[PDB]
Design a protein around this ligand. Structure first.
Ligand SMILES: CN(Cc1cc(=O)[nH]c(=O)[nH]1)Cc1c(F)cccc1Cl
Length: 164
């Protein structure tokens, strides 16, 4: 092992990222991209400039689990190849912010039952599973949460470390 993982997470910032469906997480896992509404786009762009690593921890709404976590490799940007996100009824591609590039650190899931001992100081010490989309997770809680996930032996953090 966990040493390279701990190195990537050192002095990182962490954000709880919701998805409306599994399809969008699948797209993010396949293409290494994420997009948010403008309010969270501004927060994440500020964080990306502020920290050695910004970690997105993903949870599909109503799933009772986290689906993995990834590190921002870029600020948001517009104009790339369009991503066929499954948007909710009534939401248009024009309402999205730019696209963030991300490097997956773990594509394995973690059930909320396994993180019941972790509370987030930045959300009133409620269990870390609880938060609005974009809720920041304090360093220690976020580090422990990431370390609970099953190791993803398919990923090599060597190239991630070189981007820091
Ligand atoms: C790429 N994106 C997935 C996504 C979901 C979510 O709940 N939060 C989030 O930051 N992104 C499109 C989108 C939706 F499909 C639904 C709400 C907001 C947005 Cl931006």
């Amino acid at each position: 092992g966990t040493s390279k993982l701990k190195y990537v997470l050192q002095d990182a910032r962490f954000f709880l990222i919701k998805s409306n469906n599994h399809e969008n997480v699948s797209l993010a896992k396949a293409k290494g991209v994420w997009s948010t509404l403008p309010v969270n786009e501004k927060k994440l762009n500020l964080a990306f400039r502020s920290a050695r690593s910004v970690i997105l921890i993903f949870s599909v709404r109503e799933s009772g689990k986290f689906q993995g976590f990834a590190r921002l490799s870029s600020e948001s940007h517009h104009g790339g190849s369009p991503i066929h996100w499954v948007l909710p009824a009534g939401m248009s591609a024009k309402m999205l912010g730019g696209v963030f590039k991300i490097d997956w650190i773990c594509r394995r899931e973690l059930p909320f039952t396994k993180s019941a001992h972790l509370t987030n100081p930045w959300n009133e010490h409620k269990p870390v599973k609880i938060g609005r989309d974009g809720q920041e997770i304090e360093l220690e809680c976020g580090t422990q949460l990431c370390l609970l996930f099953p190791p993803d032996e398919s990923i090599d953090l060597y190239q991630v470390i070189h981007k820091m």
